[PDB]
């Protein structure tokens, strides 16, 4: 498992742990659920790159304690 | 190539060959595949130390005919 932060533009930082070869849609759906947000209303990015359904941490070269940025659509 | 043993607690000894600067995750995945085992269920150690994804034999000072120990998680 790697630990990841999800930072909103309001400064909120919400924490997840994910295995390196698990798709990040696990984390994305979880965030939407936990935070009462529509998948429809938001996008997730890492190092500027948008994150897709099957993107994995290992594939986006994410490391423990890295930050994913969340935005409005 | 160096030859390595992978010993289970049941006494089984399964043989691999690996280059000294190749990551041991090559061998680990292979063992899981060959032996019908989940990465999830098991850990690998050498001389007491856990082995990570990118650990190499040369880096763990493994030599020809050395033994890696496998355990349940």
Numbering used by the authors:
A (entry chain A), B (entry chain A): 17 to 89
Paper text:
Protein modifications by ubiquitin and Ubl (ubiquitin-like) proteins are involved in the regulation of most cellular pathways including cell cycle progression, transcription, DNA repair and stress responses, and their misregulation is implicated in cancer and aging. Both ubiquitin and SUMO (small ubiquitin-related modifier) can form substrate-attached chains, in which one unit of the respective modifier is attached to a lysine residue of another. SUMO is recognized by short SIMs (SUMO-interaction motifs) that have specific consensus sequences and bind with medium to low affinity with dissociation constants in the range 1–100 μM. Upon binding to a hydrophobic groove present in SUMO1 as well as SUMO2/3, the unstructured SIMs adopt a β-strand conformation that forms a parallel (SIMa and SIMb) or antiparallel (SIMr) β-sheet together with the β2-strand of SUMO. STUbLs are conserved in all eukaryotes, and the mammalian STUbL RNF4 (RING finger protein 4) complements deletions of STUbL genes in yeast.
In order to analyse the contribution of the four putative SIMs in RNF4 to the binding of SUMOylated substrates, we tested the interaction of full-length RNF4 and of a construct comprising the entire N-terminal part of RNF4 upstream of the RING domain (subsequently referred to as ‘SIM domain’) with mono-SUMO1 and mono-SUMO2 and with linear SUMO–SUMO fusion proteins of variable length. These SUMO fusion proteins lacked the N-terminal 11 residues of each SUMO, thus retaining the natural distance as it occurs within a natural Lys11-linked SUMO chain. The last residue at the C-terminus of the first SUMO monomer in the proposed di-SUMO2 and the first N-terminal residue of the second SUMO monomer that are resolved in the structure are 14.1 Å (1 Å=0.1 nm) apart. The linker region in between comprises 11 residues and is not resolved, indicating that it is structurally flexible. The residues of this stretch can easily cover the distance of 14.1 Å in an extended form. Therefore a SUMO chain in solution is expected to be able to adopt multiple conformations to interact with the SIMs in unstructured regions of SUMO-binding proteins. Importantly, we found almost no difference in binding of the linear di-SUMO fusions compared with the binding affinity of ‘native’ Lys11-linked di-SUMO2 chains (KD=11 μM). This validates that linear SUMO fusions are a suitable model for poly-SUMOs and that the SIM domain of RNF4 recognizes the SUMO chain only via the established SUMO–SIM interaction and not by additional binding to the branching point at Lys11. The interaction of the SIM domain with linear di-SUMOs was stronger, with similar dissociation constants (KD) of 17 μM for di-SUMO1 and 14 μM for di-SUMO2. Elongation of the SUMO chain to four moieties, however, resulted in a significant increase in affinity with a KD value of 4.3 μM for tetra-SUMO1 and 1.6 μM for tetra-SUMO2.
